[PDB]
Amino acid sequence: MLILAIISLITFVSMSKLSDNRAIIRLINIYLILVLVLDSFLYLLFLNNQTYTVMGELLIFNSFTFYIDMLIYFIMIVISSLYGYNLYNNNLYKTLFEPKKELIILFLINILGALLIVHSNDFITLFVAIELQSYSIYLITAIYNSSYKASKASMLYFFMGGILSILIAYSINTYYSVLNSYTLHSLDSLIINTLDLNLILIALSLGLLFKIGIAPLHKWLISIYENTPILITIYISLIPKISILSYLVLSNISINSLVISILAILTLLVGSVGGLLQIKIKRLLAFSGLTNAGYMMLLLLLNNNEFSYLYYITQYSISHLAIFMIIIFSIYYINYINNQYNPIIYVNQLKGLIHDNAYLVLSMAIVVFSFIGIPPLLGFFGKLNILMSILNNGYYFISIVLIVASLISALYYLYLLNVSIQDKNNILINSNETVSSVLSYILSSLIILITFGFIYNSLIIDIFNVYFN
């Protein structure tokens, strides 16, 4: 039903004016909500890990992928509410947070390309869908074209995505040159013994992984995440991560991988010690993505990782989405707005935040202790259930390096708190205009999932016991 949305939408956007664009996104927001509500019941198809293959050995549908599908729709309902709703009714925030005409077009085409990977069985479905989502990230980066940094970032992202698309294509055709086959379904655990498919499947994994931000090739993605504006970057950070990783976690082609294990160690090291002496908030906030994409590369080495993965996915997605939404709200309280596309940059700009909207600091605290892994919060059971899979399966040096990486990464997480709970000379006493009710309810909902979401751990596991076993 994304197809019908795109086909209806681009015809509808061709006829609307510029001033209509905002309200169009509101429509699409509600549309996606009634694809969650009125169409969820398809989970009843997937009892006892019954898997389907649709369109003839082409798309594989299990309930792992159904959950990834539902997660991607939920986060788009959020991101679409960020574009489609005003923050305040000022003359300021209309020229700072304003959608383009064709923005929601590229959004839905991107989600289409990201779903056709997690649902994918074939390799040409994999390649066409990676190409579709890669074009969409090209154009979502370059759509705010009256910005020097965003155009430079779109060009950088074009060439570095072109190399790692031709590396994937070379790995697919290298796999074809030794097996007249397109599926990893053909592998079926006898062939891997008598066939040297190490170097092929590992090179395929790498060419898929370097697009995430794994650490030998991590600098260019941190540059794109700092150069893009503040609304584009909470989408292009989240979507290729969860799409490409839930591809590679579903098909288990790097087990006992020594190369994935080196790159997981190297990722947890230079992500935690990378973002220490840094002063820009999107930088600081983009090396948090490097370490938390490091905790996934561990699970690639695993067999049977579908609990640790999915729980830590929706953990990172809610925590991610919430900490980006908080520093949208701190823009009213800063004393200095530069750079219209990216209005808050330096992390010392949110300094007096406890004396002006103290419960924004309560919100910020609750989400940032969840990144560290504090046990009343939902981030801790995510790190816990990763640890239960790492220690089960023989990765003992990986585990202590995970722990040292978590301890180093707590420093620049707590730097946000250190800066936020400080004295400020000039405090706000009263504000005329207040924040959007339907948009601040989303942040309150995203906290109450993080705070009081350890409640349902038991229920989820029992539901997890039925539909995946």
Ligand X SMILES: CCCCC/C=C/C/C=C/C/C=C\C/C=C\CCCC(=O)O[C@H](COC(=O)CCCCCCCCCCCCCCCCC)COP(=O)(O)O[C@@H]1[C@H](O)[C@H](O)[C@@H](O)[C@H](O)[C@H]1O
Ligand Y SMILES: CCCCCCCCCCCCCCCCCC(=O)OC[C@H](COP(=O)(O)OCCN)OC(=O)CCCCCCCCCCCCCCCCC
Ligand Z SMILES: CCCCC/C=C/C/C=C/CCCCCCCC(=O)O[C@H](COC(=O)CCCCCCCCCCCCCCC)COP(=O)([O-])OCC[N+](C)(C)C
Closest CA relative to residue 205, chosen from 236, 184, 178, 191: 184
Tell how far CA 333 is from the center of its chain. 27
Min dist. Cβ of residue 159 to another protein (A): 6
Show the binding pattern over residues 319-358: x = contacts ligand Y (CB under 6 A), - = does not.
----------------------------------------
Q: What are the residue ranges of helices labelled H in 87-186?
A: 93-96, 103-118, 123-142, 148-178
SS3 262: helix
Alpha helices in 196-305 (DSSP H): 198-209, 219-227, 239-248, 258-272, 281-284, 288-300
Distance CA 200, CA 456 (A): 41
Q: How far is the CB of 166 from ligand X (least distance, A)?
A: 6
* CB closer to ligand X, 8 vs 445: 445
Question: By CB under 6 A, is residue 246 in contact with ligand Z?
Answer: no
For residue 22, report the phi and psi dihedrals to the nearest 5 degrees. -50, -50
Among 132, 269, 411, 435, binds ligand X (CB under 6 A): 411
CA distances in angstroms from 452 to 159, 215, 324, listed in the order given:
43, 34, 20
Considering the complex, what minimum distance in angstroms separates the CB of residue 77 from ligand Z? Answer: 9
SS3 category, 144: coil
The distance of closest approach from Cβ of residue 376 to ligand Y in the complex, given in angstroms and rounded to an integer, is 7
Q: Tell me which of 442, 447, 450, 467 binds ligand X, using CB under 6 A.
A: 442
284-313 binders of ligand Z (CB under 6 A): 310-311
Q: What distance lies between CA 27 and its chain's CA centroid?
A: 24
Looking at residues 1 to 30 of the shown chain, list those that interact with ligand CDL (rule: CB under 6 A): 1, 3-4
- Tell me the closest approach of the beta carbon of residue 335 to another protein, in angstroms: 10
- Minimum Å gap between C-beta 4 and ligand CDL is 5
Point out which span in 49-57, 257-265, 318-326, 355-363 binds ligand X (CB under 6 A): 257-265
Angle at CA of residue 27, ends 26 and 31, nearest 5°:
120
Contact 131, 104 (CB under 8 A): no
**By CB under 8 A, which span of 277-285, 293-301, 316-324, 373-381 interacts with another protein?**
277-285
Q: Which is nearer to ligand CDL, 125 or 227 (CB)?
A: 125
**Contacting residues for 104 by C-beta, under 8 A, at least 6 apart:** 9, 13, 24, 25, 28, 80, 83
Interhelix angle 258-272/198-209, nearest 10 degrees: 20
- Asked whether position 37 contacts ligand Z by CB under 6 A, the answer is yes
Of 1 and 407, which CB lies nearer to ligand CDL in the complex structure? 1
State the residues that interact with ligand X by CB under 6 A: 77, 166-167, 170, 198-199, 202-203, 206, 256-259, 400, 404, 407-408, 411, 437-438, 441-442, 445
Q: Which residues bind ligand Z (CB under 6 A)?
A: 36-37, 40, 43, 63, 66-67, 70-71, 74, 310-311, 314, 449, 453, 456, 460, 463-464, 467
